[PDB]
Amino acid sequence: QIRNMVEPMDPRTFVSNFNNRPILSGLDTVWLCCEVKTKDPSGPPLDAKIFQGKVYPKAKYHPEMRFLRWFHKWRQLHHDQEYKVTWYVSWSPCTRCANSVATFLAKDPKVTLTIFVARLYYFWKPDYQQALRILAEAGATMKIMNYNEFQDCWNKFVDGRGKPFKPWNNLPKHYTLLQATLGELLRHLMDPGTFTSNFNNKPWVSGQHETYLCYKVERLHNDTWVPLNQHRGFLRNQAPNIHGFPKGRHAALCFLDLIPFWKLDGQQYRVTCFTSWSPCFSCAQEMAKFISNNEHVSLCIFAARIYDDQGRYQEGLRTLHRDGAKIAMMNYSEFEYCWDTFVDRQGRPFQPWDGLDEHSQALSGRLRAILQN
RNA sequence: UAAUUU
Ligand SMILES: [Zn+2]
Ligand SMILES: [Zn+2]
């Protein structure tokens, strides 16, 4: 049993080190809770361990490297078989550890590794982004710890004395910022079937209401809009969950959450989102507030379909337009751009669905009628 | 809280 395999850490140690506030000073130690399991999950781990290591000065003593050494010796002492390793790490790997683990995984196909990270270390630095991409390309599955992973870590590796895990304030908001940033820096691409299903602009027949949203940023330079390749990606709405957002968080609000997190300077920026549903009234109100907030940012909203929220959505779109947002229905060129840019297309060109242009024209006429009232 | 990497 795990509590017999690990010496559980102090609750104060866990809460202070795994707090997922993305920008957090003072934490000079990395913590790593790991389980080693067989191909079959659904058991106690073969073994479990807690490693720690000071961030500075010697990366050779970071817990990732302590794990590699311990796991080498451990595998010597147990009958060989394929292993599934899981880490909960308080900080994501530094460039040296990311490269060492990537080398280890690439040279050993019998081992697969999943890394849940509480916070992203130096996510804004190109070297760290590149090293995490190298780790991903070696096979490591990298994810941000959410409530379930924090709770699992609490249950397995913390001396909670039977008390349940108590989430700190803003755990879900921090989670969404970090997950979007991880998607950006790993350059996650949308699944092609997911894109085609959600961005088809014929009248919607599915019972699902979900919103997918692709985003990019441009900077004004010498009177020309130039690309800002850093902040490009996609996201979706957060369905309601009492451990996350109890009333949900719509895709447009998650998008708005991202913009201050980018820490844009005073230059002129044009932020564009391609959203499968036009925003509901609440989303449009919040976007209008943001526009009134950040004059150095111009919003361009392209929508695949018009979402009738059974309420004030027309007034919402009119308010958004009145406040300076560019709102347009997506036409062929916008769909093709999103296919080429955000989708895991694997060389395949954009294949438009039936009636794309006709549905675009109908929806464009509807949008024009809404905005002219 | 943009957070000491030899
Ligand atoms: Zn390291
Ligand atoms: Zn909405």
Numbering used by the authors: 4 to 142, 147 to 380
From the reporting publication:
Human APOBEC3G (hA3G) is a member of apolipoprotein B mRNA editing enzyme catalytic polypeptide like (APOBEC) family, and is one of the most effective antiviral host restriction factors against exogenous retroviral pathogens such as human immunodeficiency virus type 1 (HIV-1) and endogenous retroviral derived remnants on the human genome. hA3G is a DNA/RNA cytidine deaminase converting 3′ target cytidine (C) in 5′-CC-3′ or 5′-CCC-3′ motif to uridine (U) within single-stranded DNA (ssDNA)9–15 or single-stranded RNA (ssRNA). hA3G has two cytidine deaminase domains in tandem, the N-terminal CD1 (or NTD) and C-terminal CD2 (or CTD). The ability to bind nucleic acids and form oligomerization is attributed mainly to CD1/NTD (referred to as CD1 hereafter), while deaminase activity is performed by CD2/CTD (referred to as CD2 hereafter). In this study, we describe four structures of a soluble primate rA3G variant from rhesus macaque, rA3GR8/E259A, in complex with AA and GA dinucleotide-containing RNA molecules in the form of ssRNA and dsRNA with 5′- or 3′-overhangs.
The third complex of rA3G with RNA3-AAxtal was determined as a monomer with one rA3GR8/E259A molecule binding to one ssRNA molecule at 2.10 Å. The electron density of RNA was sufficiently featured for building 6-nt: 5′-U4A5A6U7U8U9-3′ out of the 10-nt 5′-U1U2U3U4A5A6U7U8U9U10-3′. About 47% of the resolved 6-nt ssRNA surface area is buried, with most of the rA3G-ssRNA contacts placed around AA dinucleotides and on the CD1 domain, which is consistent with the findings from the two rA3GR8/E259A-dsRNA complexes described above. 3′A6 in the AA (or A5A6) dinucleotide is bound to an aromatic/hydrophobic “cave”, a pocket outside but right next to the zinc-center of CD1, forming strong hydrophobic interactions with the solvation energy effect of −2.47 kcal/mol. This pocket is largely preformed and comprised of mainly hydrophobic and aromatic residues: 25PILS28 from loop 1, Y59 from loop 3, W94 from loop 5, and 123LYYFW127 from loop 7. Inside the pocket, there are four hydrogen bonds formed (bond lengths 2.8−3.1 Å) between N1, N6, and N7 nitrogen atoms of 3′A6 and the carbonyl and amide groups within CD1-loop 1 (P25, L27, along the Hoogsteen edge of adenine) and loop 7 (L123, Y125, along the Watson–Crick edge of adenine), fitting 3′A6 base snugly into the pocket. 5’A5 in the AA (or A5A6) dinucleotide is bound to a groove conformed by the CD1 and CD2, also forming strong hydrophobic interactions with the solvation energy effect of −3.09 kcal/mol. One hydrogen bond is formed between N6 nitrogen atom of 5’A5 and the main-chain carbonyl group of F268 (bond length 2.8 Å). U4 at the 5’-end of the AA dinucleotide core structure is held between R24 and S28 on the rA3G surface, suggesting a none-base specific binding with the solvation energy effect of 3.05 kcal/mol.
